[PDB]
From a paper:
PTPN21 belongs to the four-point-one, ezrin, radixin, moesin (FERM) domain–containing protein tyrosine phosphatases (PTP) and plays important roles in cytoskeleton-associated cellular processes like cell adhesion, motility, and cargo transport. Because of the presence of a WPE loop instead of a WPD loop in the phosphatase domain, it is often considered to lack phosphatase activity. However, many of PTPN21’s biological functions require its catalytic activity. Combined with biochemical analysis, we have found that PTPN21 PTP is weakly active and is autoinhibited by association with its FERM domain.
Residue numbers in the entry:
A (entry chain A): 24 to 308
B (entry chain B): 21 to 308
Write the structure that this text describes.
């Protein structure tokens, strides 16, 4: 009854029961991939406004899609990001993680400079194509584009960037795909934006902010940029949602912090992901 | 040679009947289906309270008198659902659905599927419409006062119970025209989504000597802890075999040396848990 886009961008049709949960569908994908470390992963969909929303894994999936999704398609992905990918035990887990981190770079959720894009491309081509070959390299320049279509609009810049990636590819001769993938993920893990999911909100004064979860806790960014704040997981005594508001209680403060979101439903969703991430980093730390 | 037995039907009616030495469990169950004109009998069976006051489903292919004699506190059996479907929309006959509805309403009212005040009101509204029909067929709605509408154990607040009862009467008025099979199907579709629905668990002890509750669900074998450590499910696809050696019910996990062992109080109990989990595995396999 279902369509899932995997991290390799392949669409698979999955025939599951009527009232089967999001967890059940997640487990069937994992079984297909022979993925054993499923806890890092989940499924998301485009809602009726085409905003991405992770599924509620403990509820029937059909009814979630019937009610909130424009189309009955879900997407496999990483919901819980680790501080160090060496914590991932099996190669299949690491490969799936690697595909997700590449998508985060391609989609700009983890911004990168041109230099960073070049260095990452160098490891990725070794991971994805094996050892450099002078003939396959020139063929590649015709088959595919190395950088996303809008990143380098300047012909000479694109050419020098591409040649630099080629030189790095040659320097990585002999790296196995799992090793190249690990080096790639070890660089992406130290990049700003890694493991962050943000949402618009307003603070108690009416100012526009970005709030979200990061490796270290709940963060608040003001348009200032002058002072970003993180409430570390260990310091958060409680979290709640009520109508459009998402709220934090800190252990060291009898003053709770309130964030106004767009929706009652958005507040509930943000609260749910923040609670799940708090639980994860409690276990993982 | 003869046992004066007793059966409580799902409408809480009691029916006495004598039991021969050769009367088997499938036989007595078959008679109950005849009395109800019930054709989809496979979901249903008979259980009794054993001498330790736990529910035991009868061995259908073994003589019934002997079972009640060695194990039952009294010669009373209870008609009930042994195999809970995940969607009651699969039940085909109106008789089948109605018997399922009686069972699900008993599950709610006895408290075995926990519910909130608001759910209990919503459910009672549909049940009243199903059981009594349109409110304006009655000179007075005073019958609401004479039948138990909600689960017992948590509604000692008399004022809250008053308003709950008034809200059930209002819902009943709003449900005028809802036919009995429709209200019953709504009732069941609401119950089937509730935590605890279809969940049956049996006492054992995990290898750490803690006292757990073990059962079979669509996803696999689940282990509950009364203290509340962490409910766990072993997925069927990960269970290579299940066993009842001596007083132990055990899972031979696939891909692993791991054998998850559970101590039961009886060699009889380990065999019963095994039979019931195997039977439920067959039932879920029969449903895609």
């Amino acid at each position: 009854v279902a369509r899932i886009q995997l991290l390799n961008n392949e669409f698979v049709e999955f025939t599951l029961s009527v009232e089967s949960t999001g967890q059940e569908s997640l487990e069937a994908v994992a079984q297909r991939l022979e993925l054993r470390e499923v806890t890092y992963f989940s499924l998301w969909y485009y809602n009726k406004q085409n905003q991405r929303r992770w599924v509620d894994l403990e509820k029937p999936l059909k009814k979630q899609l019937d009610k909130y999704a424009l189309e009955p398609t879900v997407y496999f992905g990483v919901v819980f990001y680790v501080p160090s990918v060496s914590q991932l035990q099996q190669e299949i887990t690491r490969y799936q993680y690697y595909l997700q981190l590449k998508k985060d770079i391609l989609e700009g959720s983890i911004p990168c400079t041109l230099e960073q894009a070049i260095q990452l491309a160098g490891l990725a081509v070794q991971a994805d194509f094996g050892d450099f070959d002078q003939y396959e390299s020139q063929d590649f320049l015709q088959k595919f584009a190395l950088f996303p279509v809008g990143w380098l609009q300047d012909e000479k810049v694109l050419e020098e960037a591409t040649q630099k990636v080629a030189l790095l590819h040659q320097k990585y001769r002999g790296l196995t795909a799992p090793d190249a993938e690990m080096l790639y993920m070890q660089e992406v893990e130290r990049m700003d934006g890694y493991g962050e999911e943000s949402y618009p909100a307003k603070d108690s004064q009416g100012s526009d902010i970005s709030i979200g979860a990061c490796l270290e806790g709940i963060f608040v960014k003001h348009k200032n940029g002058r002072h970003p704040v993180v409430f570390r997981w260990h310091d958060i005594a409680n979290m709640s949602h009520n109508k459009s508001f998402f709220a934090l209680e800190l252990a060291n403060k009898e003053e709770t912090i309130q964030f106004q979101t767009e929706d009652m439903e958005t507040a509930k969703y943000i609260w749910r992901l923040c609670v799940a991430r708090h639980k994860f980093y409690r276990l993982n730390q």
